[PDB]
Design a binder for this molecule. Structure first.
Ligand SMILES: NC(=O)C1=CN([C@@H]2O[C@H](COP(=O)(O)OP(=O)(O)OC[C@H]3O[C@@H](n4cnc5c(N)ncnc54)[C@H](O)[C@@H]3O)[C@@H](O)[C@H]2O)C=CC1
Length: 290
């Protein structure tokens, strides 16, 4: 009833390319994992669903079919996914969630609305409502942004409504430690937490995708994190990873005794690579779950 896993985010490939290309790239990802030692250490693949971005984003294969392909080249892995609920009518959301569960997904993270909208503002099913209505989904997740306004009220409402895990935004500070200490004090809510850590490549200083992914205009806690990302991208490989490891240790040490099931979520926003997987592997060598 807990996952207690390491999850690697694997984005579906472009529709342009066809199923034969996606499979070949998956065979390459497996070789990358084995060259770094990650094969048995990654229990789940997390496949994000679709939704002014410095990288284009083109039409992708449906999460359902990319899972079919992932299963072929990674025959032991299990699967999680992300689904936006706020823009699908209730009956259509039911069909979509049923398919994902039918196709063997162990857990689904329900996602709400972007920065331009307020809570409840989609014309479809709000994630808070979805957690109640589809209580169908054994492992119902949710996004957790430790730095975001009113998140203690928001995350708690979702736990009340039935969220069983929370998947964090990319963590480039120790704010999550502050959040769950307060959260475990104010509430009896103890959901499994998927701490997300993302490899920052050199080109981030040129392109700024991770800057764009984590932005929050007048926050300052995020600006602290934004300064961290720029520091990482300006760092040569060894100094960068030790910087990341220093954060990882600080986060793991300050969370693991707080009473929440702790899982991991590893992603590479510019795509998987040996430098990312070597960085991931250094992390698990400090702490990994089971
Ligand atoms: N879809 C995915 O796979 C992932 C989603 N996210 C972020 O989660 C957001 C949705 O938040 P939920 O809690 O699921 O929805 P929600 O409907 O429960 O929360 C929406 C509220 O948060 C604000 N908000 C939305 N995105 C924000 C962001 N990136 N930073 C700061 N405030 C933001 C909105 O203005 C609104 O007040 C997406 O916009 C995305 O940026 C992060 C990682 C993964």
């Amino acid at each position: 009833m807990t996952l207690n896993t390491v999850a690697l985010e694997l984005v579906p490939s472009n529709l342009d390319l066809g199923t034969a290309h996606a499979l070949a790239e998956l065979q390459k990802v497996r070789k990358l994992a084995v060259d770094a030692g990650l094969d048995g250490r990654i229990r789940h693949i997390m496949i994000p669903g679709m939704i002014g971005r410095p990288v284009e984003m083109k039409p992708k294969l449906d999460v359902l079919d990319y899972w079919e392909l992932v299963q072929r080249e990674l025959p032991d892995v299990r699967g999680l996914c992300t689904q936006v609920t706020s823009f699908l009518g209730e009956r259509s959301l039911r069909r979509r969630l049923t398919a994902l569960i039918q196709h063997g997904f162990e857990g689904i993270a329900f996602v709400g609305v972007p920065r331009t909208m307020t809570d409840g503002e989609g014309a479809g099913v709000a994630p808070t409502d979805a957690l109640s209505t589809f209580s169908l989904v054994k492992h119902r997740g949710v996004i957790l942004i430790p730095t975001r306004d009113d998140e203690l009220s928001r995350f708690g409402f979702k736990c009340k409504e039935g969220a069983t895990f929370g998947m964090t935004q990319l963590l480039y500070s120790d704010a999550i430690v502050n959040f769950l200490t307060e959260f475990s004090r104010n509430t009896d809510h103890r959901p499994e937490i998927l701490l997300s850590f993302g490899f920052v490549p050199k080109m981030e200083s040129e392109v700024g995708l991770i800057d764009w992914l984590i932005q929050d205009p007048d926050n300052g806690a995020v600006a602290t994190e934004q300064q961290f990302v720029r520091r990482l991208a300006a760092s040569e490989p060894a100094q960068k990873r030790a910087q990341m490891l220093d954060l990882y240790k600080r986060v793991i040490d300050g969370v693991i005794d707080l009473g929440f099931p702790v899982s991991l979520h590893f992603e590479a926003p510019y795509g998987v690579s040996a430098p990312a997987f070597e960085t991931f592997a250094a992390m698990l060598d400090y702490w990994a779950p089971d």
